[model samples]
Target: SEVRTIKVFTTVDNINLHTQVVDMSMTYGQQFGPTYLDGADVTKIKPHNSHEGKTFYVLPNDDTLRVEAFEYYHTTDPSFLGRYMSALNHTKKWKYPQVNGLTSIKWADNNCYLATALLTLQQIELKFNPPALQDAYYRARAGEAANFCALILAYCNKTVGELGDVRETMSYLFQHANLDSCKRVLNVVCKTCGQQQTTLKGVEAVMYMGTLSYEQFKKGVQIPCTCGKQATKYLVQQESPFVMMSAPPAQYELKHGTFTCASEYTGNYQCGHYKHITSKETLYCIDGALLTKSSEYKGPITDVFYKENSYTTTIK
Candidate 1:
């Protein structure tokens, strides 16, 4: 159970800021070597001892040193970083648009020196604020999010739920999914029904993210759910945690027997995937990832029909 931890610190005008840990042995041996410190003469610098084999080092406080400290502190010390961020953006209650996020971070890592002082202040926002860490993830197929290329928002689909929960609730979800990424399942009560019939948008969204089949998802007039919620009301809520991002490959139907999605509000149609609402004899998926079948009947499958959605519904 040995853990070699690294910590870096630098002092400026009596104030101290920190750097995150460097634990890997490979990087450790390399960075600590006198050459990797860019050939800086450490003989004159104060030494930071290795206590219990935990690494610590001190760098002379200067412009480059301060920026390096910020680079490390940004990701690990949110509480400490927020003070500078808040102060810069606030004064006499009349504040300006704050700088941070990917856009601002890029400038800190690059750009000219004339703006160095101002950009350094801006870098504080990008380094400390977790929002800069967001990845460029999104849905692939068309008509998925809001259907026909529109999008809203959704959830972590686990205990982590949304960002607005209690403070103890973690902040992000790339660490998402798996009934709780890192096992953090919070606001979920109980499921009143199957994934489709229930208003649990997050779980329901997953069912459709799988490969296609003609026999998945619920159809016809909606019914009450078992985990507890309305039929359709809670599902499409503008604020529900339903998200297609990170959803598994949808394995249901493209067009079920009853439900039909047109190109527009009144367009052609599509189906559910991963499964279907049809009977045991028939098979169909929204993405058509499988064969449309029926009870004890062996046919071209595609020729088989579930209640002939042509009349009862739209064939997805």
Candidate 2:
């Protein structure tokens, strides 16, 4: 097995925390060298002022405190927590599936079933992917589902202080080891949750908890609709700075300049659009703004309508 050297950080907030660096070889689950305390000779210390204020550091054996060296390694490892963030970044450019036609109860029910089934299969894959982790995954997933259900129920009932309980339970679920459960939660969020309201003329008034609209059902999920209709799509933005850089330098520059130039920089946004679904009217929703207009229509044309008149963009 080959070996690779890496540095790790240990910290405590309140005390004058020491720092150390250790060399780690790339071996399966291999243990690294003992952490070296830089300034403090004692292995342990207690600070009186406050637990929140105690802190420490781990430094390499070299006399020079090359903070950049640590940073260089941190930046180099694509699999570091930072790299996981980049993986998330690639997801943002995804375009939503186009939908066409009228809204109906049958469409909503079918979409719900498909979305929920996808959520379940996603869970199955996560649990069963690693045979060794399957049982633990199942247990963890069940716990998460139960916990999330409790929060949803509490919210529906409007229970006092339920928001705090929901937050705590969600944190616990997030910290748990089961990837399947977490994935299921995400699937529900991506496919089966969120508001879906429309005011298109001639189409029945419909509300949805997921991304699917009645038109989405008329068109196969894989096919782009030709009716000049546009649907609202929700996307999760990447949080990692590394992922943000993966775009071409030009795109990255554009994003940095217009979007993320702030003291406390966090990356995320909801972009909205209205797409034309048919020759009759543009099918699209406004972002951040509530639907304020409604119309009725009678039409049967299904082929691709003129693209020029069908698309409108608004940023909020």
Candidate 3:
């Protein structure tokens, strides 16, 4: 493995987005105060103890985005919308496992902030914008997740803005979400944030589909080939960034499918060894570590033997 990375996070929930009804009155007053702010901090809070030397990304948006919704009006007056109680722990935040009720849902979850914000956002939307509650139908028509999300941001700016508890919670989320952490990515994980953003990555940029642009996993070795038989430093530079992504399981795996000592004669290293021979043979460093040379033959193409990383190969 090139390098092992650990997502920096702490399992802690100090925020509350749950709707509180003072005997189902729902209006003329609420407590989006300290307890609520604490819950808000639960999503926006956490110390990265292990993130010091590693590269990571901060989420631009939370899953539970805030927006104006029908919650304050309907959920409280269930006498009209009808009495209802959630069997599910709606106050829970994050996608964590359900084990022995031993863990805080917020802490167990991967996208703590995301889930928190979205849950709150969903509640507001369904209640405030009664029509949006028909998510299956409404969302189907309002396709384009990114666009919907943008609309949610703008909407929540006012929705949660009016609601108390986490007062201005929407304002904080709307005014601050960082929707630009990565226009570039590595599969599901955002290299910049080190956070997983599969949906974001997919719905993110248009340059790839329109203007078009450029492009680039992780693994460990088992039957470890600790030492590559004292070979003359080999340098294999993959043209595409993607190729490098597929690092050999071990050093031996690169031996042209065979193993040979470095001093062992193989074949002459010629201009062909360099993918772009026209660019003159020059000294280069690979992975910013190994160093090697790619040279050119003056005239005669004579057979020369050279060894690299315990590999012996005869090529054209």
Candidate 4:
């Protein structure tokens, strides 16, 4: 049987920083791929390596015209999209503290006060780099960062209808920035929220941001859960390639029963294992069974549990 083929058609125009016109088309199976680059005016032709294998029929005119053609296999699997969305959501979530707080009425009011002080101190820090203003700039902006925290609180209360733990969310912020700066910002947030201002030692700040228990949080802040059953389910259901295809297989099953059992047989197993067969008929039976099974199963499988249980295991 001929394997199914997928073709990705991409057209890029008006290339500029932050914004660009992109016309993309995908053809699957035997469908004729469509091209739509008529509207864009062509200028200088610069064949970018990035544009290789893509149909880039440029229109007349000089406007930095570049065209290329490339084809790659495509699947309808949601894995890639899910991963992209997850990454987007994570980025947005990280920026939430900054973006939401940057322009809030309360945060604006607090930030005006704090920014004025910080700006003054920042100017001084730039001028003379004194320990006093350095400490002051750190302390003051710590207060301004609290404005961001308050903004986060307001956003959670308004959008989510309740304040989830801020510790976890803010810890995400601190982990990206300096630890001392994070502590100071947390102190500022605590002060703004009427919580106790305490110093988080080392990467403990990462846990504080996740809102997990101290012990649970301390175990591994950045490491993802090995048994993220819900996440796994969602990824599987969503068919995200990043979550599914990005990792190795999950499990394997032996074809025949153990040596002590009635169906005990040994030889080369289809699951990448070789066994010495003491019983010839058992081996023949196993071989026939595997041959029959091969027609039914698809993808890779394992003969034994090699590593930790994972999602990659498949019936082969």
C-alpha lDDT of residue 31 in model 2: 28
Q: Estimate each model's TM-score.
A: 0.19, 0.17, 0.15, 0.18
- Best candidate according to lDDT: 1
All candidates in order of TM-score, best leading: 1, 4, 2, 3
Whose lDDT is higher: candidate 1's or candidate 3's?
A: 1
Kindly list the per-residue Cα lDDT of model 2 for residues 107-199, writing each as its tens digit.
Answer: 111122111211222222222322212332343243322222222222223222222221222223222223321210010111223333223
Residue 225 error, candidate 1, Å = 11
Regions of model 4 farther than 4 Å from truth: 1-101, 104-164, 180-200, 203-316
Output the TM-score of candidate 2.
0.17
For candidate 4, give the lDDT of residue 80: 25
Q: Every model's Cα RMSD, please?
A: 20.1, 22.3, 25.4, 27.4
lDDT of 1: 0.24
List residue ranges in candidate 3 displaced over 4 A. Answer: 1-177, 185-316
TM-score of 3: 0.15
Cα lDDT tens digits, model 4, 205-310, are 2222222122222122232333432111110111111100111222322233221101111222322221111111232212211212221222222111111111
**Model 3: residue 302 alpha-carbon error in angstroms:** 50
CA displacement after TM-score superposition, residue 45 of candidate 4 (Å): 27
